Design a protein around this ligand. Structure first.
Ligand SMILES: *[C@@H]1O[C@H](CO)[C@@H](O[C@@H]2O[C@H](CO)[C@@H](O[C@@H]3O[C@H](CO)[C@@H](O)[C@H](O)[C@@H]3O)[C@H](O)[C@H]2NC(C)=O)[C@H](O)[C@H]1NC(C)=O
Ligand SMILES: *[C@@H]1O[C@H](CO)[C@@H](O)[C@H](O)[C@H]1NC(C)=O
Ligand SMILES: [Cl-]
Ligand SMILES: [Cl-]
Length: 323
């Protein structure tokens, strides 16, 4: 196996089939990638950091909401966000991300990493703390919140679900620029039979995909780093799954090396469990933009601005009448 990820994952498979934890807590830079990865020095900076710190995922929680799931939630909303996105998070709080309760309790968390000053980010830590005290929906870990560290955001969130919210019935994970018709989510979840609910995982699933080889593309992956195809994976900006599956997914994450694209990593983890994400037409990653009617029978639409999220949500409340 010439590609680095394939070779490391293959060695990891041998580790987890022992005869008859250094890839999870080794947080010093793995200077070995310098020599074994051909052309390491001309790879972009994001690939260098990813390869160097691939074996470290024991990052701690700087901001936590321990009593978030004191009450068994029916649906846990887990929204990926960045420190400066105060308006996106607030618009979500006021529209589709509203918490609720009586057997259908809805709880909300925002998943943040660090935007550290050493990367020239403006110091917004005081406002972030003020926001966390006021809305109590901020979870923040001490890792650099970057594009290629989104798999870390995934794994660390699944860890938090395991320790702090293991009894949530269902989990929705999505981006902070996606509108979610949470009314339609709850209706769909309530309609599920017990067999389909237990290992539920639906989204905008992509089949027969592979790494983009064009260096200019955002999702570009060099052949040096990864070879082969991509598993079926839910992409876009949101997928929905059962809490039972989340607990299974987290325990398999140790057996799968982190991958630079977090959605592919989640698809990989599903493949390791022998599961297949289910494609649902209601997840329209793909839809630019009146027509409130499309919004009643959708589950989520990517993507929307803060103002649009509130505008669509207010309209959506009167849509059973109009549409
Ligand atoms: C994902 O997040 C982790 C956690 O923040 C990042 O790891 C950190 O990476 C930086 C490099 O940007 C490391 O800083 C370097 O440390 C060496 C130590 O000798 C120093 O010589 C350099 O000048 C630089 O300061 C930092 O140690 C490391 N932190 C931990 C806890 O491992 C990682 O880079 C992120 N990955 C991506 C792809 O962004
Ligand atoms: C991970 O664990 C090792 C060994 O316990 C520790 O030295 C390291 O600082 C930990 N990593 C982080 C990011 O805390
Ligand atoms: Cl502090
Ligand atoms: Cl914002």
């Amino acid at each position: 196996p010439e590609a680095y990820w394939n070779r490391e994952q293959e060695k990891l498979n041998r580790q987890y089939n022992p005869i008859l934890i250094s890839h999870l807590n080794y947080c010093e830079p793995d200077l070995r990638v310098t020599s074994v990865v051909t052309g390491f020095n001309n790879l972009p900076d994001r690939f260098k950091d990813f390869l160097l710190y691939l074996r470290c995922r024991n990052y701690s929680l700087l901001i936590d909401q321990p009593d978030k799931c004191a009450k068994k939630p029916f649906l846990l909303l887990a929204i990926k966000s960045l420190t400066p996105h105060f308006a996106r998070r607030q618009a979500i709080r006021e529209s589709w991300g509203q918490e609720s309760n009586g057997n259908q309790t809805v709880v909300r968390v925002f998943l943040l990493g660090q935007t550290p000053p050493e990367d020239n980010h403006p110091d917004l830590s005081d406002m972030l703390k003020f926001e966390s005290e006021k809305h109590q929906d901020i979870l923040m870990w001490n890792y650099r919140d970057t594009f290629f560290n989104l798999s870390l955001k995934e794994v660390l969130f699944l860890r938090w679900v395991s320790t702090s919210c293991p009894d949530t019935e269902f989990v929705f994970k999505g981006d902070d620029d996606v509108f979610v018709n949470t009314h339609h989510i709850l209706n769909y979840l309530n309609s599920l039979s017990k067999t389909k609910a237990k290992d539920l995982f639906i989204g905008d699933v992509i089949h027969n995909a592979g790494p983009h080889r064009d260096k200019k593309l955002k999702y570009y992956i060099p052949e040096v780093v990864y070879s082969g195809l991509y598993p079926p994976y839910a992409g876009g900006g949101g997928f929905l799954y059962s809490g039972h599956l989340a607990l299974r997914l987290y325990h398999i994450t140790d057996q799968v090396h982190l991958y630079p694209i977090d959605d592919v990593y989640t698809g990989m983890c599903l493949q390791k469990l022998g599961l297949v994400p289910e494609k649902h037409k209601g997840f329209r990653t793909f839809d630019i933009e009146n027509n409130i009617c499309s919004y009643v029978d959708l589950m989520l639409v990517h993507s929307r601005k803060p103002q649009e999220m509130i505008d669509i949500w207010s309209q959506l409340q009167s849509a059973h009448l109009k549409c």
